[PDB]
Specification:
With 326 residues, the protein is an alpha+beta fold. It contains 16 helices and 9 strands. Helix 1 crosses helix 4 and helix 6 packs across helix 7. Bound molecules: 2'-deoxy-5-fluorouridine 5'-(tetrahydrogen triphosphate) (B7P), calcium ion (CA) (2 copies), chloride ion (4 copies) and sodium ion (2 copies). The chain binds 3 DNA strands through helix 2, helix 4, helix 7, strand 5 and helix 15. Belongs to the DNA polymerase type-X family.
DNA sequence: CCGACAGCGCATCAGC
DNA sequence: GCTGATGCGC
DNA sequence: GTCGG
């Protein structure tokens, strides 16, 4: 947190651009700048020193100068005073409400938490769940609880079919002391890039986790991605644990390494790596790394036996999960 | 200057 | 119903 | 908002 003030500032600017201006590239520009500053190993003394880093240009440099000179940013001070921007920003904190729905609600006079509750009839299913657990989803999850949740998920999945493999990814796999939510990568040998030999492979796992009252709500569910809500069991007389977001991703077993690289993140790390892959003439998604030909069209999947192979292909030295927290 | 900015699953909608 | 675009989230 | 060519 050497430059926490600056990275907080840029993050609030990124959120503004995404939520209020709907300017997704400004949002990504501010987030990249915040990311590169967060790993800079010195206390930044001036915007000119900051402009040296890639992704910090003239505009951000000047903002950093204002922030360093005064401790604040007038442009953010104004955004914070504007009722409509602040309302739009707030409503996007509910899961399922993005910038478009947020502005639509605010334009209808739905501006507060109370307003959402009073108008729950106007929400789709995802939004209603996001509102139900709004307070809970704000909380982080300590790693000790993540370890208990891991124990439950892996054991319940073994009970369904011992050939499943569940891997907890995201910030947990990167070694974080607390996580925003739980990400579970699932494989099974009957589901490969070649064939699906069994149906309902994800459904059964979700069904088992519902049966033991671990999963409590479904935000969305298809054949390969589940997004819902879970909760640790509590003891006699104990306050209940907060409800937690859980994401489950069933990946073809032969594409495990691209899948776990994707799901381990961070999102910014993935964006840097995939951008770099493009520069080196490849494209990476959660399934494959493919070469781009002269026309820039994806060719056939390259062979991959490890996370490190993906790094090797784009001529990056290997970075362990804990060093991917960008 | 100016294109290019990572990649994609699921829910919902308009249009057929 | 399907297809393609859009919103949303990871 | 930033920047490589
Ligand atoms: O845009 C994205 N792209 C993108 O590849 N992923 C990938 C990378 C990310 O680690 C993983 C899970 O997403 P989270 O939103 O759960 O991110 P965490 O890094 O786990 O942090 P937290 O501790 O839960 O807050 O999906 C997320 C995106 F959101
Ligand atoms: Ca997570
Ligand atoms: Ca997640
Ligand atoms: Cl933009
Ligand atoms: Cl400020
Ligand atoms: Cl793979
Ligand atoms: Cl692919
Ligand atoms: Na720079
Ligand atoms: Na939201």
């Amino acid at each position: 947190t050497l430059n926490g003030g600056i990275t907080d500032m840029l993050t609030e600017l990124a959120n503004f651009e995404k939520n209020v201006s709907q300017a997704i590239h400004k949002y990504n520009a501010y987030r990249k700048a915040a990311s590169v500053i967060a790993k800079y190993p010195h206390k930044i003394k001036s915007g000119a020193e900051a402009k040296k880093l890639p992704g910090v240009g003239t505009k951000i440099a000047e903002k950093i100068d204002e922030f360093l000179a005064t401790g604040k940013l007038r442009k953010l001070e104004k955004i914070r005073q504007d009722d409509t921007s602040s309302s739009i920003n707030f409503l996007t904190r509910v899961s399922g409400i993005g910038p478009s729905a947020a502005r639509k609600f605010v334009d209808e006079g739905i501006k507060t938490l109370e307003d959402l509750r009073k108008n729950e009839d106007k929400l789709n299913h995802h939004q209603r769940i996001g509102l139900k657990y709004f307070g809970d989803f704000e909380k982080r999850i300590p790693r000790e609880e993540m370890l208990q949740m891991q124990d439950i998920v892996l054991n319940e999945v073994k009970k369904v079919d011992s050939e499943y493999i569940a891997t907890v990814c995201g910030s947990f796999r990167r070694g974080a002391e607390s996580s925003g939510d739980m990400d579970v990568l699932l494989t099974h040998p009957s589901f490969t890039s070649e064939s699906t030999k069994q149906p309902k492979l994800l459904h059964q796992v979700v069904e088992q986790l519902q049966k033991v009252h671990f999963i409590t709500d479904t935000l969305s569910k298809g054949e390969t991605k589940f997004m819902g809500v879970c909760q640790l069991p509590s003891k006699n007389d104990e306050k209940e644990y907060p409800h937690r977001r859980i994401d489950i991703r069933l990946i073809p077993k032969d594409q495990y390494y691209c899948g776990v690289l994707y799901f381990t993140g961070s999102d910014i790390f993935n964006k840097n790596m995939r951008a770099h892959a493009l520069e080196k003439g490849f494209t990476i998604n959660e399934y494959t790394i493919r070469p781009l030909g002269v026309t820039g069209v994806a060719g056939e999947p390259l062979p991959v036996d490890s996370e490190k192979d993906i790094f090797d292909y784009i001529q990056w030295k290997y970075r362990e999960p804990k060093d991917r927290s960008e």
